[PDB]
Amino acid sequence: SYVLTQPSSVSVAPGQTATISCGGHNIGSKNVHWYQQRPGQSPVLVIYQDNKRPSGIPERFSGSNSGNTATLTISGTQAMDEADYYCQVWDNYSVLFGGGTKLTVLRTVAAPSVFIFPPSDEQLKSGTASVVCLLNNFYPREAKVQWKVDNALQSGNSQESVTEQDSKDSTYSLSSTLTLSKADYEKHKVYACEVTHQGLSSPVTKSFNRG
Amino acid sequence: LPKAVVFLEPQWYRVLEKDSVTLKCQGADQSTQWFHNESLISSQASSYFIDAATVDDSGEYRCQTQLSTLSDPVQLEVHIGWLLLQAPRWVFKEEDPIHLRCHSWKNTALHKVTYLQNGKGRKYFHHNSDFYIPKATLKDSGSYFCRGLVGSKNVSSETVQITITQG
Amino acid sequence: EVQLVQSGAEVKKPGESLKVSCKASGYTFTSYYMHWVRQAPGQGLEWMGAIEPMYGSTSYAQKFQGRVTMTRDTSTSTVYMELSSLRSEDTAVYYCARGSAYYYDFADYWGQGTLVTVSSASTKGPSVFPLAPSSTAALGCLVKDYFPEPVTVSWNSGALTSGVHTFPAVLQSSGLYSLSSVVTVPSSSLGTQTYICNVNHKPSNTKVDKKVEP
Ligand SMILES: *[C@@H]1O[C@H](CO)[C@@H](O)[C@H](O)[C@H]1NC(C)=O
Numbered sequence: 001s002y003v004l005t006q007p008s009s010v011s012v013a014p015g016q017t018a019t020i021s022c023g024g025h026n027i028g029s030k031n032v033h034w035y036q037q038r039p040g041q042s043p044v045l046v047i048y049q050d051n052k053r054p055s056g057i058p059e060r061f062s063g064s065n066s067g068n069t070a071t072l073t074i075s076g077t078q079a080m081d082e083a084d085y086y087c088q089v090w091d092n093y094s095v096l097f098g099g100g101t102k103l104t105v106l107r108t109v110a111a112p113s114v115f116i117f118p119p120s121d122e123q124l125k126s127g128t129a130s131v132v133c134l135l136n137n138f139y140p141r142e143a144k145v146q147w148k149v150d151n152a153l154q155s156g157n158s159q160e161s162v163t164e165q166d167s168k169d170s171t172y173s174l175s176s177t178l179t180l181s182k183a184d185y186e187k188h189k190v191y192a193c194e195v196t197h198q199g200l201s202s203p204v205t206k207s208f209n210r211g
Numbered sequence: 212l213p214k215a216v217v218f219l220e221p222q223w224y225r226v227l228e229k230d231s232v233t234l235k236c237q238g239a240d241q242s243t244q245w246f247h248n249e250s251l252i253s254s255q256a257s258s259y260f261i262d263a264a265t266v267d268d269s270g271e272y273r274c275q276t277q278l279s280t281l282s283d284p285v286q287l288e289v290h291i292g293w294l295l296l297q298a299p300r301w302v303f304k305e306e307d308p309i310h311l312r313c314h315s316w317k318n319t320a321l322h323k324v325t326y327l328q329n330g331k332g333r334k335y336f337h338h339n340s341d342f343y344i345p346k347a348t349l350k351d352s353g354s355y356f357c358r359g360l361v362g363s364k365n366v367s368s369e370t371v372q373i374t375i376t377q378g
Numbered sequence: 379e380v381q382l383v384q385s386g387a388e389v390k391k392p393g394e395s396l397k398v399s400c401k402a403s404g405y406t407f408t409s410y411y412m413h414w415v416r417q418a419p420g421q422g423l424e425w426m427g428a429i430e431p432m433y434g435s436t437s438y439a440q441k442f443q444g445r446v447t448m449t450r451d452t453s454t455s456t457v458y459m460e461l462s463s464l465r466s467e468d469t470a471v472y473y474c475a476r477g478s479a480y481y482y483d484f485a486d487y488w489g490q491g492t493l494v495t496v497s498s499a500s501t502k503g504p505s506v507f508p509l510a511p512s513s514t515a516a517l518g519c520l521v522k523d524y525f526p527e528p529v530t531v532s533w534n535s536g537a538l539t540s541g542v543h544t545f546p547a548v549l550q551s552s553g554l555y556s557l558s559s560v561v562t563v564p565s566s567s568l569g570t571q572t573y574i575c576n577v578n579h580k581p582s583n584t585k586v587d588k589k590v591e592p
Contacts, residue, residue: 031345033484042473042488043423086423090345090483093437095425115516120507130520132509134560161545175545175558221409222480310481318433340435343481
């Protein structure tokens with residue numbers, strides 16, 4: 001029945017201080033704990049009981065609990081601090097978690113470099129044609145990819161997947177796969193992948209011709 | 212220079228007969244010394260085990276190493292009866308957690324457990340779970356005891372006086 | 379130390395049961411509670427319950443009451459969790475976590491997690507296809523139609539590290555996963571240097587090496 005409210009995202013420049021909130025009705029009445037969860041790893045306790053720190057955690061991690069907001073504060077943020085952070089409380093013989101806040105690191109706008117890939121000859125014997133388009137090393141994360149087949153916009157037949165922010169350059173990369181049957185693939189000639197991004201004045205269009 | 216410390220495992224300082232208690236000595240030769248009522252017992256391991264507690268195992272316990280001094284006395288109470296409310300201590304600082312346990316003799320079938328502060332119910336459980344206060348207020352001071360269904364009879368535990376302090 | 383080793387990954391079909399184990403080590407097992415937390419793919423942590431290992435007392439979240447069962451074996455320091463009537467929404471990584479300071483107010487240690495994929499699909503190794511570069515260049519491999527997760531890709535047996543992006547996999551309409559792994563190289567090297575992707579799908583024990591050439 002108790003609700004903990006966390007922000008979706010938190011962005012901070014390198015070296016600068018990051019703060020993550022966790023709201024609950026009279027949350028100062030409770031001891032609040034925080035956990036760090038790097039993308040594909042197990043959670044790690046960073047702050048327990050409002051302010052106390054476990055052994056081996058850098059002193060730049062600090063916690064505060066007063067009123068209806070508990071706060072985790074990271075001073076000189078580094079690329080290792082890029083993770084999800086969850087607040088946790090014990091309420092009426094049950095443990096509850098917040099929604100989790102994703103720590104983002106800010107940098108200057110980087111335009112993506114676009115590469116389009118035709119399907120393989122081996123996968124054409126499979127009966128399905130996969131057309132791949134790649135957007136490499138761009139910032140910020142938002143980017144709009146549009147598939148075009150014989151000047152006909154493609155919809156509902158392409159899936160996107162985005163990497164996590166790079167550890168050294170702090171950019172993202174996006175891969176979009178347009179799936180078509182071999183019958184539909186051979187029925188058309190031009191296959192294009194148009195990209196819209198912040199760092200691009202005009203939309204970039206990488207295309208190929210089947211055969 | 213450093214001084215040894217006796218550690219109760221588990222934390223409960225009051226236990227029932229036939230219970231299992233492990234006392235651990237901290238400090239830093241790798242031998243230890245153990246004393247009961249200011250009297251050396253022959254066990255010189257780092258941890259002294261009580262497999263089945265009797266009432267004469269009660270009292271204070273002290274320990275020392277060759278690299279630590281005589282510890283401060285840690286008292287132990289082995290109680291008679293069927294039900295017992297267990298605590299790690301009886302004086303708490305404000306905002307500290309209070310973890311209590313209603314335990315039956317040899318963990319006999321315990322159901323419908325009620326924890327009471329000043330003769331009024333605080334928490335009721337269907338089975339036999341522990342009582343917990345995350346942050347101790349000053350209103351949590353008073354006499355505590357538990358009551359439940361030990362097999363077929365309703366049993367009420369003894370009193371434990373818990374006092375909440377400030378500074 | 380204190381270690382929490384969990385059982386291996388599991389494949390499940392809807393309506394079945396999952397039973398996961400958590401072997402504790404490096405401390406007095408009966409003195410500390412044991413949490414059980416799950417995390418759906420891309421979602422947040424969700425508390426499922428805890429168990430008092432000394433006398434077996436439990437406590438469950440109300441969303442899982444009547445469906446979760448937690449036991450422990452003191453003689454083996456092993457904690458067991460079980461969830462019945464599995465649906466596709468139950469696909470998650472299930473963690474065990476030691477309760478701190480002789481209760482379960484919070485968790486000070488975590489296990490490595492156990493992947494449980496509840497799906498109608500069955501275990502299948504992936505098909506690898508080359509993503510040929512065009513005429514800085516980019517190429518990669520397409521790891522399509524496999525189940526379950528995960529699958530990992532290395533390039534030139536680990537000699538090629540910087541410039542490699544292995545993307546998060548996508549679950550298709552067919553119930554099989556699919557991902558891409560690319561790498562950016564100078565256009566100067568496409569004629570002499572060979573580029574191999576070393577895909578490894580441990581769930582199916584599938585290991586494929588594919589050569590991506592112009
Ligand atoms: C030590 O004293 C306590 C209380 O004075 C008593 O309960 C216990 O039986 C005594 N033990 C011995 C060995 O005399």
